[PDB]
Amino acid sequence: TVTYTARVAKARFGGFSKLLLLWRGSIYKLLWRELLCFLGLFMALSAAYRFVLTEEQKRYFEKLVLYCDRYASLIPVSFVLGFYVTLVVHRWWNQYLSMPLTDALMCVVVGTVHGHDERGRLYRRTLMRYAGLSGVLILRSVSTAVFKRFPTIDHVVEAGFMTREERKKFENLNSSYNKYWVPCVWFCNLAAQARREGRIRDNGAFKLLLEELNVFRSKCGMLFHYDWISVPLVYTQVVTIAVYSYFLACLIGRQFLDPAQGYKDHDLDLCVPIFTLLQFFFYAGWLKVAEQLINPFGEDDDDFETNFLIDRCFQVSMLAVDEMYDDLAMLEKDLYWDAAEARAPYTAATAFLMQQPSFQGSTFDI
Amino acid sequence: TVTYTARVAKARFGGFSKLLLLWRGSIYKLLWRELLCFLGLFMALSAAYRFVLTEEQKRYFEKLVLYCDRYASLIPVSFVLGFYVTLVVHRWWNQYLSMPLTDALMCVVVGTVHGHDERGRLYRRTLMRYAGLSGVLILRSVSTAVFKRFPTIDHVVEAGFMTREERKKFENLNSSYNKYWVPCVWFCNLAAQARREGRIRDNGAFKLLLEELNVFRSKCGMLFHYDWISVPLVYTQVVTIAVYSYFLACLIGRQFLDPAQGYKDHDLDLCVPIFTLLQFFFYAGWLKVAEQLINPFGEDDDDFETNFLIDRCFQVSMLAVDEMYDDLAMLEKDLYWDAAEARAPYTAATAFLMQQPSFQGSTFDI
Amino acid sequence: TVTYTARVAKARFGGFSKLLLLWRGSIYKLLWRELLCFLGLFMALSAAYRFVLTEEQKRYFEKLVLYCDRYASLIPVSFVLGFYVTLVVHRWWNQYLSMPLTDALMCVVVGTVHGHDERGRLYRRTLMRYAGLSGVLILRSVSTAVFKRFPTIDHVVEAGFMTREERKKFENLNSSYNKYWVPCVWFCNLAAQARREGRIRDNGAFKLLLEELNVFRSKCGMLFHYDWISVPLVYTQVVTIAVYSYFLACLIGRQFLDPAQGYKDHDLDLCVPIFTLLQFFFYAGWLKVAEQLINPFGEDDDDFETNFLIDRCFQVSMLAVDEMYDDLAMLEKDLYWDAAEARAPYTAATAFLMQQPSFQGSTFDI
Amino acid sequence: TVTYTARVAKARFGGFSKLLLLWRGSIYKLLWRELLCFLGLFMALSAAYRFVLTEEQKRYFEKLVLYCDRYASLIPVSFVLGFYVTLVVHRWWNQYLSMPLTDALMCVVVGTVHGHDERGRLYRRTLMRYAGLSGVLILRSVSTAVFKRFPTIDHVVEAGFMTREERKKFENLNSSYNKYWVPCVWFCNLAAQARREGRIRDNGAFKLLLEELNVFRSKCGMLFHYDWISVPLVYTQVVTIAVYSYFLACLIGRQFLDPAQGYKDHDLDLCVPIFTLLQFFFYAGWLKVAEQLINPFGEDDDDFETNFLIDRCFQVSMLAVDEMYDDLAMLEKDLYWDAAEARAPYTAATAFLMQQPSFQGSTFDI
Amino acid sequence: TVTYTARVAKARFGGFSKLLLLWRGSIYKLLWRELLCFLGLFMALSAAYRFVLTEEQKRYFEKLVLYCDRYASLIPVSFVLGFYVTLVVHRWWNQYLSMPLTDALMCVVVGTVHGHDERGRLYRRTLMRYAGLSGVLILRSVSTAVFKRFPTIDHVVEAGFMTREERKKFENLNSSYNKYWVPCVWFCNLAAQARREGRIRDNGAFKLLLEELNVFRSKCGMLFHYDWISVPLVYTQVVTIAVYSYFLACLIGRQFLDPAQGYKDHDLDLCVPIFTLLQFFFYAGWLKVAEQLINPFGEDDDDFETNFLIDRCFQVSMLAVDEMYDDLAMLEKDLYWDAAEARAPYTAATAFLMQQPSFQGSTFDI
């Protein structure tokens, strides 16, 4: 993804206009091939009108220009763009929320699966490795960047997400369907094994572990659903036809006609259709928002950094359940033990502008 | 469903335009009968204007063409299309989310219902068979493809979802209503039987099983609600009248009049209303998005593959609770036991483009 | 409700157009009185223009027709129709989801409240009768069809939802507010009584029963909220004024003026304003979608069948907790015990069109 | 709130038009001062054009009228009205859902906090009084009607929501922030005290009590968030400027010019701009929907009856946990004990129109 | 944030118009630099048309003015403004809901972590300090105001959110990623330590503590997701190009041409484009709603007061778990113990307007 959150923290004078100078993840990277072929096909029709066509063929083409400018209905293209892109954006955000993230599991695992010995250490890592394995298996199914990192299951074994013994049981499962849910079943068998030996101390801890896994597994199942159940193809084709019919109407209907015939609204030569160019940046760019986000798991610049989230979850969950298992600093009194209230100090860059009346409710200054 | 997720992974130059060459689940499969009758009725009026009508009947028809072009309000058809299709798409996605999927149940069942013996094996399979039975019974009520696969309850018995003894108790239940919830009540009786004999070891395991079933049963109840409570018929008829009134206005109001009378905006002969054809692809295709998705359980190409999801859930849940019950690979140290951190390697097709600064927050490059 | 889900299963050639032949729950049943008075008031103005008005009064009326056609802004009526009806449809669907349905309670009750004896049988039925009683009491408050079925509380006693002893405690509660929540408090007292005598065997079962009831009771409270907190009246009046101002503008502004004065866009006589009639079917029908759904608990054809849902829930929950309490078929091996995988067979009407490659992910055909 | 749910139960012929005769909570109560000043400023400009201006000053004003009618863009005002009011309506409904309602707490308290003695009675009432106290404290912060009922905390003590001993501990808490969450902390201390003495019998009961309180406390925190975090002021000002610029354009651009100069679309005298008046009812009334609902806790007619909900919750929860604690009618057989099925009878006003085939699914009439 | 909730409590006559006099968080503070450069560039073109250009260069510029007024399509800018700002507002509200608030944790901690001694006191404060520490660490990552208050981790140690011993374990964690989740792992280690020593008395209390923390930790993870995954940059650039192309079209297309050439719709001199100025307040202000809210964690006036919420949560949670741990007022009878019902009194400013029939349901006045 292209992150510009710091650029737009405060609404400044040229704020969104300086985002028109970015190139990575931009409209210009997405549209310049389409803009050059649209403008090239415009100049080719404009040059045929000037130097190629005979005088009676120019009059017929002039009647064709006035015809197509009637059908350039720029207003209804916006609704099928507005409703469709909002659908794609809604799917795009829920696909990010369905990312297999092991943070909720790693807090349950470090709190409930016990033992400083090598066995309890191996219980905690294998539970997190199985959650990470289900993450890798569903992301190499839906994300082309994860798939180029893990083209085979042997790549998942040499990366350490799966072992060779787990590889044998994975491949010997007779199922024609995608086996991303298999380490989630291994998680339940491992947690039930840990409950039997008392490494999970109580049944509410074991229940919390299985509630947390089902939340994780249903997120993996949701990424498979979004990958399988596309935005409906008829709806993608309707918005594509509506945008391209508008631009077919524009490269004839916005041609600069010869002013000597006195056609109204056609008394000018610019030899570049600059406001049709800006309409192309608007409407074809609005469609490119959907074209970038309809599969947010490819290698667009604004697509999800799924290999980063795999490396983050695997490193952090192994960090949380192995090194950080039961090493607190000793319980020690804070700065505000002798203090009835508790307020942290401000720097000089925040003390001066803040420190203003605390909001108590709207009805109190009555 | 028609899945084109891999085609649109990266936003390419001709990306959405190559989806206009697909036929399965396309606008062209949905609209070509309507387009040929619209264009045929257009050419029939155009031929009556040329060769049939007398010269004074042509002038009256010419006044009728100018009348109907005033009422071709292409803008308000788009709002009742945009708001209605978004409602249908919202129902269509929530109907997919309400699909009876046994994955969350199969992780609880393999983790909580215990025993390698034939009895505990039979407990785990019957719990999954009862969840799958409620899935088949609600899907043959709402999906025509499941219903043609299971036309009678005897078809459900010969498919193995129900047994002959379960068939007797199913048919002897005196209820006039659909009995899809009956195996969910059998699930609760079976899980309570398994808790009594200690195959479910603790009450939090038994509670998790019943929470998971109620989530499954309410998904089955939601598919019945969507099947029963349609999109409101008055709202379907308003969008149908609005689209067809627009196209009734178009096959008169876009007729190519004789240029010798000098009617403005009517100085051309194309003998094919090509931009009215593209408007028909836009508006009637936009309605066809709703017509395909209003019942997503029929045999449209873009309808849900409900027999596939039945075969997947039954095969996977039987695979998860029978063969995969308590056969882990032995707890064995990963690649990153001697390693404080944990990073999986990259292939050459992903190492070169990735490996870029880790995002820590927007405020840190301040 | 009017259910047409089977009619629109597959998108057919005349699919939504055959729904324009339905009468029950249709636009024509909702609009024909309004259409006849609109067309009657149109013909009355058209007849006054032809035979009543003098020649100088016709010119003033002709200036009035050209005035009102300027203000027929058909575009902004659509936004206040599109945004308002979507609000009403959103409330209409959430009101259906808030229906008091006892299925989630009946699965907990049959799984947790125990005993084949007459006492445990009476515990299970009274818990379901109290849930059904809260359903009847909130639905006779919000639904006119339930209220005509239960006009008094004595009707609820003779229907068997309440007993005479429960009637005394119901009427002796000193509260000015609606007492639909009273059997939900009786449910909690009954479940706590059953936990004390061990008919509820464990505390997690008793907790699940009370979580399930609070979900049921908050659904009853939500139906009271929707009944009390209407769509805001100012917003209902704004959309009513916007639609009727448009149609006031239309029955003057679309009058067929005398062509001898040569008023432009007014050179025709149809003596029926057929495209204004179709605009009336569009806009007034779009408002009628809201008028039918703003209270979905009346006796519109497309209103909820609330007496059916009362009869279904009472019959099914009594069927689930009394006859179906702990009578499973004996645990018996399925068709797929000797089979490593598990696939159900297809009929000849589904084997031929299906059996096509299983989707594994989008990235795998790379 | 103004409740008209019974008026719109069945979609009738003059149904929404009879809601234009209501005055309480109406557009006319909200708009008549604005309509009289708009029409008064219109007539003042119209009278200056007739009797005050000289003949050359009338021509300049006539050029000003034709200028401002070009900028009366009634279409884009509707989008910033449609999107903004939908945001306000969404906040308005979620603010009603965040109302502190003690029904879910009172069902847990009567089911889990035990004892017929005066101590257990005092435990149940104090738990409900503390929930009601947090309700009063957050509603007097956000609702002007609750604040005029409880202007001081001493008013809350004389109303009985707080005691004098609780008043001392409330005032001696050193916190500059609003202390609405303080009785929720007292609830947790009281429930933990009741668990220690076994008035709460099991830990799952005590956990359910604390889950239920956190749902209640987060609803109180949500009302504080909505009160603090307004609809953004820039967005309120944009919709206010857009509506008033349109109406500034209208009281010049819709002036009836002198027909003797022959200005087109200006050949009439009405001396009342009746369709501009109806546009004012549309657009300024649409803004008044937002102006009424942006703070739904004031004393608008359509604002929430927050003092009613305080009196309802306090009376009902004291009724539920004190008098209704453990007085069931004795477990007694229903009307349908000797009956395998269970159907309640119909009155003559509902038997005749109902009793129609039970819906089983869409696929069954195949 | 700029809070005006009390100003708009009752819909008054000049209600939203008096919000056009506010300056803090206003359109005028956001737009005046853009308005002065737009009007300055307008007057510069207007002065070049009057005094600089020759008479034949004025005619070419006049043809350019009529060209650009054709492309000022004010209608489609509104849809890409309406759909985009609604997306930004939806993200802005969910970012406020994802704020790390310790109220739900502090009610569990004071109810479940026990002991009046210094050890149990230190357990309760350290659990709340660790929740507050994760709040500070994620807010200094996403909020520039928190970051200027805590520029280093040493600032977090001198503020008392972290200790020096906790600082050593924080810095010695080998992770390249943001370590905001580290005190949430410390929370789980501390709660598991407290359960082992019986300061947490039961396993359901310990489970509730870990469910509550995972809700808190996922809110911290959600703020990181929103900070990382921006509104997509192509969509921000499309709405920026659409607004600025419209205003590029306006500062030529709305130029006041010389009336002596008799250009239609151009017969006036105002020498200030006042309705183009109001359109600039509309459209550029509508974009400024998004520009203020796209990062709601900066130092805009309408941005979130994140340092206030840090100081509130830290002061209140230390107040709730230390001083308010197990000091109830003694269980004492309320005002309504001898009263069967329970109604609080009204002041004279609320008794007179209220006391009106209690709503029982819509169907009861039948």
Ligand SMILES: [Ca+2]
């Ligand atoms: Ca992409």
Ligand SMILES: [Ca+2]
């Ligand atoms: Ca279909």
Ligand SMILES: [Ca+2]
């Ligand atoms: Ca109705």
Ligand SMILES: [Ca+2]
């Ligand atoms: Ca208000």
Ligand SMILES: [Ca+2]
């Ligand atoms: Ca900001």
Ligand SMILES: [Cl-]
């Ligand atoms: Cl639980």
